[PDB]
Amino acid sequence: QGVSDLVGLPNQICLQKTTSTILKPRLISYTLPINTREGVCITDPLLAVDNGFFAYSHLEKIGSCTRGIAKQRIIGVGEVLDRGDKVPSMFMTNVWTPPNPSTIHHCSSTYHEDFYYTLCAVSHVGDPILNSTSWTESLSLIRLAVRPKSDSGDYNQKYIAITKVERGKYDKVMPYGPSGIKQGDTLYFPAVGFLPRTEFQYNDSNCPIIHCKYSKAENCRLSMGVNSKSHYILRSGLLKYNLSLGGDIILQFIEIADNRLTIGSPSKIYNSLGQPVFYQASYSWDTMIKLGDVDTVDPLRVQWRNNSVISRPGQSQCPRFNVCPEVCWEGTYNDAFLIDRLNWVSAGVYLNSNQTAENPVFAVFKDNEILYQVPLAEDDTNAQKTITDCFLLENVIWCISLVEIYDTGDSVIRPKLFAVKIPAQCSE
Amino acid sequence: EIVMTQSPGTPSLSPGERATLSCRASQSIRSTYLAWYQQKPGQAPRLLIYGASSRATGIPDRFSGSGSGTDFTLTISRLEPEDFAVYYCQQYGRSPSFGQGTKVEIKRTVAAPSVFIFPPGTASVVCLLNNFYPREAKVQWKVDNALQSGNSQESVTEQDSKDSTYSLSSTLTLSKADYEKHKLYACEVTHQGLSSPVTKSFNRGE
Amino acid sequence: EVQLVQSGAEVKKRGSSVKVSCKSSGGTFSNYAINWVRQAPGQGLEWMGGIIPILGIANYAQKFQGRVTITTDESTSTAYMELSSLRSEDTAVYYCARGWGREQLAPHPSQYYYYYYGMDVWGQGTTVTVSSASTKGPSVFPLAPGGTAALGCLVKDYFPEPVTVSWNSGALTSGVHTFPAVLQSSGLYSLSSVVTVPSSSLGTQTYICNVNHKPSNTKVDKKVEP
Ligand SMILES: *[C@@H]1O[C@H](CO[C@@H]2O[C@@H](C)[C@@H](O)[C@@H](O)[C@@H]2O)[C@@H](O[C@@H]2O[C@H](CO)[C@@H](O[C@@H]3O[C@H](CO)[C@@H](O)[C@H](O[C@H]4O[C@H](CO)[C@@H](O)[C@H](O)[C@@H]4O)[C@@H]3O)[C@H](O)[C@H]2NC(C)=O)[C@H](O[C@@H]2O[C@@H](C)[C@@H](O)[C@@H](O)[C@@H]2O)[C@H]1NC(C)=O
Ligand SMILES: *[C@@H]1O[C@H](CO)[C@@H](O[C@@H]2O[C@H](CO)[C@@H](O)[C@H](O)[C@H]2NC(C)=O)[C@H](O)[C@H]1NC(C)=O
Ligand SMILES: *[C@@H]1O[C@H](CO)[C@@H](O[C@@H]2O[C@H](CO)[C@@H](O)[C@H](O)[C@H]2NC(C)=O)[C@H](O)[C@H]1NC(C)=O
Ligand SMILES: *[C@@H]1O[C@H](CO)[C@@H](O[C@@H]2O[C@H](CO)[C@@H](O)[C@H](O)[C@H]2NC(C)=O)[C@H](O)[C@H]1NC(C)=O
Ligand SMILES: *[C@@H]1O[C@H](CO)[C@@H](O)[C@H](O)[C@H]1NC(C)=O
Q1: Residue B33, helix vs strand vs coil
Q2: Which member of C31, C103, C108 has the closest CB to residue A65?
Q3: What separation in Å is there between the alpha carbon of A386 and the centre of ligand 4?
C-alpha cells in the first residue's frame, strides 16, 4: 500500500522477450526545481530513492559545464507519492544550499529513518579526480530531515565537517557515486580511495590478455589510474558511518575486492528484494556492465554478473563492447536496478551508441538478453549519465530514471527524470 | 580527421544551365553536420548550405542541398554570371574539414593558342600562349637539341571577361653563362584545339 | 547587422610569429564561435581552429595543435589567432569567420565535446607572407616582337607583392593580360604583362608599360621597341 521499497512479493512482470514497445515512459521533472534558463549548465546530478523518500542534487553553473562559474548547489529531499492517478511523483520538502557553491563535490546519499545523510567532498582545487595531488582531503555531511519540523533545532538541516577518517593505506578517500545503503544503524556510501601508484601491488600475470592479441600485460595496472603515469590509482569501495558510535564521527574506508578489478569509478549500492546489489561504472577497458549481488559488505566483495548485452559508449581506445585490456579512462555511468532476483532481471538506461554520448534507452534485461526496451528520447539525443531506482507503488514495480541530456527546447545540458511502469504482460 | 573529396575538380559547362557537384566523406556522417560554401574570384567565401539542405540568410533559391550518409550533392538550377566560382563542402562539428573545392568554369567553343616567344648574369626566355581554351595545354622548352626539365616556370590567367579564354606565360631562367654555349631556343605548345604541335623558335642574332 | 574586421597584411621572417586580429563591429561575441580558416595561394580552405568565448574554450585541428593559440578579449569584442615558428608553408590568407558553437556531453568521465557549426559571417581576410627576403624594387625589362604581333613587359625580382602594370599610362586595355606572379627560388617574385597589337601599327604607335611596386615605391616606366 502506498509507495514502498522493492521488497516482498511484487505483482508479476513480463519475463518474456518482446520487440514490441510495452514500456510507457513519463516526464515527472516538474514537481522538482529545475527551472530553465539558457546560458547555464546543470551538472553533477544525484538521485536516490528509499522508503518512499528521495534525495536529489545538482550544481548549476553559468556557461561551460567544465569551466563555468558555479551559481547554486542544490541538495534536496522529499517524498515519493501517488498523485491520485496511480503514478508516482516526487515532491521536494527540504532544500539545502551551501554558501559557496564551487566547493562541494561528489556527493552521495543514503537514507536512515528520519533523514537522508548525504556525504560530500569539500575542494578548493576543483574536482579531486583531476587535482588529486592538490586536493587536501575534506569531507562534509549534510543531514536532511525528510519530514521537517517547526522548533526542532538542527533536526531539519545539519552540516558537520568530518575530522576522523580511517583510510588504511590509502592517502585519501572520497565519496564517488549517487547512493548507498543502511544495515541496521550503519550507513555505507559508495566511495573511492587514492593509492600512490608506487605502493600498488598488482601481479601483471593476472591481466587477462588470452586471445587478446594487441594487449600487453601491463595494461591492467596502467589502467588503474587516470592515465598511464598518474601519481595515484583509484580503488572503488565503501565509506562506513556507524550511527550507534557517538562522539566525533568516524568514517572508515572499505576497499572493493580485486575480482574483475577496474579503476575506481562512480558506483552505487542498494537493497533489492531483501539483499544488497552493487553497480560500478566501466571507466576502463572492461566495458560490459559491472553489477551483481553483494556477497559481503565488509570486506566488500561483489558477485559480478556475466552480462553480454549491456555496455557503455567510449572513445577510440575503449569503445562499447570492448573486452581486451587497454590503457584508457573512458566511458559513462549508467546504473541498473535488480527488480527480480529469481531470474536476475534488471531495469536501467543505456546509451545506444559506440563512441558517442547519445540515444538513451530504458531496458529490462537479463544476463544474456534484453527482454524489452523503449527509447527515452530521439535517435541523436545527447545523453550521458543515468541513475535508475525502482520501487513499488501499490505493489507494482516502478522505476525512476535520471538522465543527463542536452535539452534542445532550452539549449541547456540538464537532468531530466522519467517514470516507467514495468508491465505485467508482454502483449498489449 | 575526416577527409572530404569533391568532384569534379574542374567542370566546364554553359550559363543558364543546371549543375550538380558531389562531395564524399571518408566516413559516414550525420546530415546535420554539412555545409556548402562559395568563393567568388579573389574574395571571401560565403555560406550556401548548412545541415546538407538549407539556404541561409540572403541566398537565392537556385541553390539546393542533397545527400546523406557518405554522399552529398549541391545543385544549381539556373546558372548565372556570378554563379561561376569555386565551391567547397565542409563537414563540421568536433574537427571540421573542407573538400579541395570544385571550380565551375565557363563552357565555350574550343580555341587555339597564339604562340609567341620573346628573347632577353641571368637571362629569361619567355613563351606566351594567348587566348586559348580549354585550360589544359602543355609547353615544352627546347635548346639546341635538348628537351628541358625543371628549369621553367608557368603562369595562367583566369577566364577572360570577353571571350572566356586562357592565356599562359612560361619562362626559362638560366644564367648568362650557358646562354652563349647554346644556339637555338624553341617552345613547343601542345593543345587540343590545334592539329599538331606548334613551335616558335629563334637563334641569337637578327 | 554585423561584419568582422581583421588586421593588416603582414610580412614576417621564417621562424617568427604572427598574431592576427579580428574584431566584431556591430555587437559582442555573445555566444557564437569564431573559427579561423586559411587559404594558401592558389589552394583550398583548411579549418585551423575555433573558439567559443562564452564558454572559454578553444579547439584546434591536429595539424595546427601547439602552433596556434586562439584567444579573445571581450572588452574589445576581439578575437586573436597567433601562429608561431612560421614556415613558408604558412604563407596564406587567414580569414576569421563566425557561426554557432555548442557544448555537448561526451563518453568520458570529465571531458566535454565542442561542436563548431557552419560559418556564416566572414572577415575580409588577412594576408601573411613569410620569407627571408627583403623589400626590393623590380627590374622592368621589355619583350618586343604575321598579321598580329605580341609585346610585353617582364617585371622581375621584386619581393613584397604586389606590383601593378598598365599599358600606355592606362590608355591601352584591350587585348592585355597581366599574369599572376610566380616566386623564384631566390625568394623573389616575377611577373609578365603582355599585349596583342596589329603588326601594321608597330611603327604607328608607341607602347609604354607602367610598372609600379609600392612596397619599394618604384615607378619604372619602360618602353618596348623592335
Ligand atoms: C558498434 O560496435 C559493435 C562492436 O564492435 C566490436 O567490438 C569493438 C571493440 C571492436 O573490436 C570492433 O572491431 C568489433 O566489431 C559492432 O557490432 C559488432 O559487429 C561485428 C561485425 O562487424 C560482429 O562480429 C561478428 O561476431 C559474431 C560473433 O558474435 C561472428 O559470428 C561473426 O563472424 C562471421 O563474420 C565475420 C565478419 O563479420 C567473419 O569473421 C566470418 O565470416 C564469420 O562467419 C562476426 O565476427 C560483432 O558480433 C558485433 N558485436 C555486437 C553486435 O555486439 C557494431 O557494428 C554493427 O554490428 C551489427 C549490429 C551490424 O549492424 C553491423 O553491420 C554494424 O556495423 C558497431 N556499430 C556501428 C554503428 O558501427
Ligand atoms: C587544479 O588547481 C589549480 C590551482 O588551484 C587550478 O588552476 C587555477 O585555474 C583557474 C581557472 O583557470 C584560475 O583562475 C586560477 O588562477 C588557477 N590557479 C592556479 C594556482 O594556477 C586548476 O584549474 C585546477 N584544475 C582543474 C581541472 O580545475
Ligand atoms: C556500531 O557501533 C555499535 C556500538 O559500539 C556496535 O555495537 C556492538 O556490537 C558488538 C558486536 O556486534 C557487541 O558485542 C556490543 O555489545 C555492541 N555494543 C553496543 C553498545 O551495542 C556495532 O557492532 C557497530 N556496528 C558495526 C557494523 O560495526
Ligand atoms: C560469471 O562467470 C564466472 C566464470 O564462469 C563465474 O565464476 C566461477 O564460477 C565457477 C562455477 O561454475 C566457480 O567454480 C569459480 O570459482 C568461479 N570463479 C572464478 C572462475 O574465478 C561466476 O560465478 C559467474 N557469475 C555468476 C553471478 O554466476
Ligand atoms: C606473481 O606471479 C608469479 C607467476 O604468476 C608468481 O610466481 C608470484 O608469486 C606472483 N606474485 C605474488 C605476490 O604472488
Answers
A1: helix
A2: C103
A3: 28
Q: Which ligand does the CA of A258 lie closest to?
A: 4
DSSP string, B152-171: EEEEE----TTT--EEEEEE
Are A373 and A346 a contacting pair, CB within 8 Å? no
The sign one gets for the Cα dihedral C93, C94, C96, C97 is positive
Domain shared by C116 and C160, yes or no: no
- What's the CA gap between A195 and A88, in Å, rounded? 43
Q: Quick one: C112 and C180 in the same domain?
A: no
CB environment A401-427: b (16+ within 10 A), e (fewer): bbbbbbbeeeebbbbbbbbbbbbeeee
Please name which of A173, A334, A167, A350 lies closest in space to residue A264, comparing C-alpha atoms: A173
Residue C152 belongs to what domain range? 133-226
Nearest to A129 by CA among A312, A326, A329: A329
Residue C155 neighbours by CB distance under 10 Å: 28
- What's the structural domain count of chain C? 2
Method of elucidation: X-ray
Residue from B130, B119, B122 nearest B174 by CA: B122
Task: Please determine whether the domains at B1-108 and B109-204 fall in the same fold group of CATH.
Answer: yes
- Considering C132, C156, C190, which residue would you say is the last residue of a domain? C132
User: Does the beta carbon of A305 lie inside 6 Å of ligand 4?
Assistant: yes
Comparing CB atoms, the residue among C54, C107, C112 nearest residue A355 is C107
What's the C187 CA to ligand 4 centre distance in angstroms? Answer: 73
Note the CATH number of domain B109-204: 2.60.40.10
Please spell the DSSP secondary structure of B50-91, one letter per residue.
Answer: ETTS-B-TT--TTEEEEEETTEEEEEESS--GGG-SEEEEEE
Residue A350: closest CA among A269, A264, A282, A270: A282
Q: What is the CATH number of the domain that holds C192?
A: 2.60.40.10
Strands B114-118 and B19-25: unpaired
C59 lies in the same domain as C112: yes
Q: Could you check whether the bond before residue A190 is cis, i.e. omega within 30 degrees of 0?
A: no
| Residues in CB range of A154: below 8 A, 6 or more apart | none
C210 Cβ contact partners less than 8 Å away, ≥ 6 residues apart: C164, C165, C166, C167, C169, C170, C219, C221
| Protein residue with least CA distance to atom 20, ligand 3 | A244
* B149 Cβ contact partners less than 8 Å away, ≥ 6 residues apart: none
CB A302 within 8 A of CB A257: yes
Atom of ligand 5 nearest to the CA of A201: 13
The label of the residue with cell 566535454 reads C112
Classify strands A164-166 and A250-255 as parallel, antiparallel or unpaired: parallel
Nearest to A279 by CA among A375, A200, A389, A359: A389
Mutate to test the interface with B, among C143, C156, C209 (most CBs of B within 10 A): C143
CB atoms within 10 A of CB A147: 14
Count Cβ–Cβ pairs < 8 Å, chain B vs chain C.
Answer: 114
Q: Is C93 on the interface with A (CB under 8 A)?
A: no
Best CA proximity match to B1, nearest among C38, A381, C37, C46 = C46
Q: Is the CB of A244 under 6 A from ligand 3?
A: yes
**CB-based burial of residue A19 (10 Å sphere; 0-12 exposed, 13-18 middle, 19+ buried)?**
exposed
Rounded Cα distance between C221 and C174, Å, is: 19
Subunits adjacent to chain C (3 or more Cβ pairs under 8 Å) = A, B
User: Residue C112 and residue A329: Cβ atoms within 8 Å?
Assistant: no
Cβ-proximal residues to C209 (8 Å cutoff; 6+ apart), any chain: C140, C152, C153, C165, C166, C167, C193, C221, C222, C224
Flag if C105 and A411 touch (Cβ within 8 Å).
no
